[PDB]
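User: I'm putting together a teaching handout on how multi-component assemblies are represented. Below are the sequence lines for each component of a complex, exactly as they appear in our records. Could you produce the 3D structure of the whole assembly as structure tokens, so the students can see both representations side by side? Please keep the chain order the same as the input.
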Amino acid sequence: EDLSNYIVSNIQDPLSRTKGVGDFQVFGSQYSMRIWLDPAKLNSYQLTPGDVSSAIQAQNVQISSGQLGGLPAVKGQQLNATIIGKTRLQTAEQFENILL
Amino acid sequence: MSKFFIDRPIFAWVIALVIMLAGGLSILSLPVNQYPAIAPPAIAVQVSYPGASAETVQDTVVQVIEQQMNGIDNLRYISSESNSDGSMTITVTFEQGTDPDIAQVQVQNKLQLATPLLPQEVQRQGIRVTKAVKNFLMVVGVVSTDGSMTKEDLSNYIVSNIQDPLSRTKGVGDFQVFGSQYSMRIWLDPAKLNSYQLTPGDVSSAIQAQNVQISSGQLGGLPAVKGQQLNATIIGKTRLQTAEQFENILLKVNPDGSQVRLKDVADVGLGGQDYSINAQFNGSPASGIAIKLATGANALDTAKAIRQTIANLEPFMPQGMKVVYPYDTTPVVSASIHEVVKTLGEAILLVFLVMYLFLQNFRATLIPTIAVPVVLLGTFGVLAAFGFSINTLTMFGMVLAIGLLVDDAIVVVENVERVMAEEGLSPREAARKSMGQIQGALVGIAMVLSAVFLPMAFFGGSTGVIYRQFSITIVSAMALSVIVALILTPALCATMLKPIEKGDHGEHKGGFFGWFNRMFLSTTHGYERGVASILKHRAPYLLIYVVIVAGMIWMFTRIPTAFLPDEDQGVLFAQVQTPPGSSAERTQVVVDSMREYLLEKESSSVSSVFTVTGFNFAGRGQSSGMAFIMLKPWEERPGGENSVFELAKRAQMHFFSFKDAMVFAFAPPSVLELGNATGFDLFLQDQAGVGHEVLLQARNKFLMLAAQNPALQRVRPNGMSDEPQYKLEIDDEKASALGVSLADINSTVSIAWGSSYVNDFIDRGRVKRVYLQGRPDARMNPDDLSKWYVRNDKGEMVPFNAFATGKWEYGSPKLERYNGVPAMEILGEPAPGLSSGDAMAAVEEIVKQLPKGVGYSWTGLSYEERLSGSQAPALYALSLLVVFLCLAALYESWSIPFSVMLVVPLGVIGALLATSMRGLSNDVFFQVGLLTTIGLSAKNAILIVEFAKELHEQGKGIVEAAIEACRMRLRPIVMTSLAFILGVVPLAISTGAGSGSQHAIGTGVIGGMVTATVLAIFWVPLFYVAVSTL
Amino acid sequence: LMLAAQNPALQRVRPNGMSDEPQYKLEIDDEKASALGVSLADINSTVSIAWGSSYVNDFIDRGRVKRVYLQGRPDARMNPDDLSKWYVRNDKGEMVPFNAFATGKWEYGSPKLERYNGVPAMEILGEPAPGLSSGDAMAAVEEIVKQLPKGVGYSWTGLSYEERLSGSQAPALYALSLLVVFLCLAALYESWSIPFSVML
Amino acid sequence: ASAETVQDTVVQVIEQQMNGIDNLRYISSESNSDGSMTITVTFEQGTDPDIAQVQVQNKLQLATPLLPQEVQRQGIRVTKAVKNFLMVVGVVSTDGSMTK
Amino acid sequence: IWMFTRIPTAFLPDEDQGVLFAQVQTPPGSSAERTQVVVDSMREYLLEKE
Amino acid sequence: TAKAIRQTIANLEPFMPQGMKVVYPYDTTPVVSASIHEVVKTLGEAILLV
Ligand SMILES: CCCCCCCCCCCCO[C@@H]1O[C@H](CO)[C@@H](O[C@H]2O[C@H](CO)[C@@H](O)[C@H](O)[C@H]2O)[C@H](O)[C@H]1O
Ligand SMILES: CCCCCCCCCCCCO[C@@H]1O[C@H](CO)[C@@H](O[C@H]2O[C@H](CO)[C@@H](O)[C@H](O)[C@H]2O)[C@H](O)[C@H]1O
Ligand SMILES: CCCCCCCCCCCCO[C@@H]1O[C@H](CO)[C@@H](O[C@H]2O[C@H](CO)[C@@H](O)[C@H](O)[C@H]2O)[C@H](O)[C@H]1O
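Assistant: Of course. Below is the structure of the complete assembly, with chains in the same order as your input.
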């Protein structure tokens, strides 16, 4: 799995843009965030996979926030900066600490 | 073949007649424009993700499209930018000769494959794929005089009023308007909202549900039971036409039995989609169109068209609506093809004179006057055949080409009459005779010249594109003149020239001519004597040849390596960048001042200023603005002071003060497509998916090591640097505690702060957008963040003060990728005197001291340089090897060929000297003119070595055959060099439109001619005799 | 067509896209709607899939994917008054008629609206009367085109655009061809005499 | 949609992009009350129909975003217009076993 | 130069191609059952008479 | 195209984690080299035998 992930994330796209290659098939995958539900728990807290999903869909989001120097601005304004709202997660810890 | 046509003048005429008609017809159809497609074809994919951040676009949009950007034909490299406003741009670069049409389609199709994979807000936005090449014909300005209308008001005007009529006039290609049409914009008041306990999100769904053109059925639709007799149809609902209607949508109905409406929440009015870039033409706001020449069209006719068209519209246009034409290319294009028909006509003029001078007959005067236009017309036909265009490079190609055109006429006419003079043969027999002498050498020289030019056409890249233009055009002329000078001129001589009695040299002619013939008669003898003594004392001279050779290799190592020339296109750039943060007011005033300084101190040279904010050549955003300084016509500002290059000087002086922003002034590249000419560029990139701030380290170690380097100077980074960013941090816990859902908290911080593309309304017929967003005064400061309330678990409105907590972190306002990986572009020039090859050599050393995990790759003219550069030696050796072989046959020796090739240097130094004496450089115009000169120089030598060996064959001595040849050849070579230097002088001293390139050629031409004429005549015989012996 | 039916040169003079057709309406105020509890999510997407139809789902049929469609009964869907028969649910439970919750008027639309080169226009065909020819025909039209309002222009298309082409080439044609025969005869027989005599 | 609201929300806007295509001879659009639209672009008597298609496409990739949210869903068809029918292959019921 | 100017200009010769087209354009809004009647009388006049 | 892919991967090799090496499991091109080079060889043989 380790190797497969290199290939795809690193040498795949360069290869796929190399002159002459018209198609390619990788024997493996690149990584992904894996969420392994367990009904032996879902059950307890009386929860469904559907309830999960919808959470991930709302807690692992890259959101269009805005900026303080908002354009069109107000006369005199002299402070412009991008405000960055919720930005999606990288690590499992971040994925482990989402509230259902 | 010539002895054949000499007896068939009518046939000979008919061939000249056809080559004429073809050419004549072809010059019609033939397209007209300033440059070929010299730039690597590129396609741009662009969207804006309203309210998004540079990361919320490279990570949700760019990276995606990229991962689907493979399996496209002829892909060279691919580069993207994702910046602080919603905007994104990915540019896919293709190899030269790639049909933009299929490139586009291929690239846009892969775009489709990744569309559904994209954020629905972007998806809904609409992604544009465009040919991303800056061949802008003209640039129409449309301004508001009385400041009544804004950019937004105006761009809507040109979209519904002058976009259709523009697109429908001949030769109009890809235009792009500055700004969008209209869109219903609404601005929510948080205070006023909280009141009626309504959330932004509500307003959205409110308008989504109350503005629809619902599917309508049919009254009598099939199937239908008998009796059916009305199959008419019904029209469903309708969309909101006015902003008034957008104020009547019920948001809430109170227990009081009252009606709450949008008015009671926000202001509703027409506006623009994106407010990110502001354009002012002399203080007052404006927009306009950047027009491109339709593929195949005539840049002249089409400029007139897109001028009368937005002139049949000026009456109807509102008050204050004045149309300007800031940038326009047809002036120069028109000029540099007036200054061709001119120098052509005067060429044949000068020939008629210099012809008359040395000769007598007004008749001999007629030959070259027919045989030259005939070759010009036809030469165009060949261009059609090859699908070339009448353009700036293609026409200069013909300028350089008359040197050769004029020769083949007078070389042939002079020689018939020399034979007539010294043998008293008739027109025919003397035609028949000389054509026997020269014929073969003509075929011979046509091939030698071919090897001299053609190679350059096999160059890759954009340099190869411009070379190929000269090559193909000046080889077509050459070859075509050789055929005309084989089947047309000889007959013309045979037919039109009058006879002359043996031994007659016009010495007793009396009058001025008598003086002249006598004088020249003496001078030739002088020449013979010179040569005669040079052959009687070889060694010393041979030595002095080595010397002048040495000096040629010296001059090359002491001459500017610059790319193509620098002209004075009536434009000057001013790139403004106020410090991080900043605002669309600050920057907008830094540039607002630049207009004054120019229009109050340089009003002697500056016509008008077109200024822009929120947009650079190095970044988008508020901390960046620009000024396109437009200069008065060429005449109305003469003198070196009123030159772009002098204007730029003062500008940067005055602009050097400003300790707020950072203004820079400079002139566009010679050719207006990413022209760093002599200036490298590069992408640092992290192959090993290392940190982004690790990249920053890598970049900063680079620059702070390029300074510690001798070889490079002015190593800047392209693209803006990190700014302070205000990071929100909503508390997933406290939020649910109060009872507020994350869905509502985000969706609310969205529509409030970043825009929201909501619904489609239709007005004036066309569908336009509808943008929901918070009040300006409601989103200017961190505290304003609190003014926004979300509805709780139920009933109560909760303020951001509750869960929202701010922080000031750093980030990049413009993220860059190159070949799928994140990168940072850096520019630079080589130190004074050093070459780009030296620069690159050094850079490739200060890249090994980079953070393991970071790599690089050349991208611009650099990528090209390194390619075309590798083939240079190959091509030279090939033209060398082929030229020899051709001479080898022309003479039937492996030796005497060298007696013609050693002539090359003679004419070179003259060009070099003149070029440095004039303080110019290795312009492509010089580089090419340098071949066009060792062309004639060669032709001159081959004919005199030709005649030389003919005599040695009739059984004369080498030394005698040499001097006898020289004597025979002197007259002709004097009349061409005289005819030619004079023909080119005007260019060498031209002033005004495009003069700058006309200088690049003439300067070195005269230098090359003068030095090669004088020197060839003495050293060629030296060479011939020398080798014949050894 | 007035003059076209009268003029003795042309026949079968058709149009394309006849006059204007009768249409209806469905004016509906969001007032009475939200009165008895009916938002614009039901009454909106309920009129559509009843009077016209509605592509809903796919379904396999002997191995070939096809479509399931939702139309109202042909009985109640074929006439103006058959509007009221349709009821929409309440935000509370009860049902709501189209009576005091929707009105229907009566207008005139237009079956097809035609454009040529960024401009509103209308195609009109026609054959030439027996004996006469396409040209003779295009001649007549060319005149009964002036009897039109100063602003209603015209232009040929298709098979007539094609005829205008070959007509406007013949001159150049014959010319260049004469020109060639002259030159070739000239070159061939080293003469200006016999070419020039051949031409005559 | 009405034949009038169609020619004004779809037709009118794609022509403004069909304008100025290589070898364009003329354009004839058609707006119906079926909601159906169909603009026809005729090229000159010797141009390559593929690039002609490829070109038309390339221009649409610029007008689409100005189209009703509805149309953008459907999918606009680009295809090579012919006025001819080679021949109609039909089938009849020889008994009464099958209907229209 | 006289005859030339007095002969009818045309394009291609009309030609019997064993084929004919009949377009029925029944009044606006008329029923599908109303058109089908007019189109059947076609067959009659044709299949039965000519 | 084979010469190219090796130019891409050999351009990416210095950034692979210290431990792993790119290998070439299945490759058809080597035979195309070998086969022609073999004919070239039978040329020098023919030309020499002749
Ligand atoms: C030369 C600088 C370096 C290279 C990159 C930048 C080059 C200059 C780009 C200028 C683009 C200007 O023109 C643009 O017009 C369009 C409307 O058509 C809107 O901008 C927008 O167009 C459409 C909406 O129509 C959006 O979907 C798109 O995402 C957005 O880019 C703005 O009005 C304006 O941004
Ligand atoms: C009367 C005139 C008679 C002759 C008329 C025709 C002259 C033709 C001259 C040669 C034209 C060569 O055309 C030119 O070849 C070079 C290769 O050599 C191509 O360029 C390609 O090959 C070179 C050499 O391997 C590479 O370094 C380069 O990266 C690559 O893109 C150009 O893209 C092509 O346009
Ligand atoms: C009128 C029709 C004439 C048809 C024949 C025309 C011949 C014209 C002159 C020679 C053209 C040579 O075309 C040229 O060949 C050289 C050598 O292969 C290529 O160059 C490449 O190979 C050579 C040999 O390995 C290398 O030393 C060189 O570094 C490399 O770049 C050039 O990039 C290409 O442009």
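A couple of points students might notice: Residues B 95-97, 382, 454, 457-458, 460, 464, 472, 475-476, 479, 867, 871 surround dodecyl-beta-D-maltoside (ligand 2) (CB under 6 Å). The radius of gyration of chain A is 21 Å.
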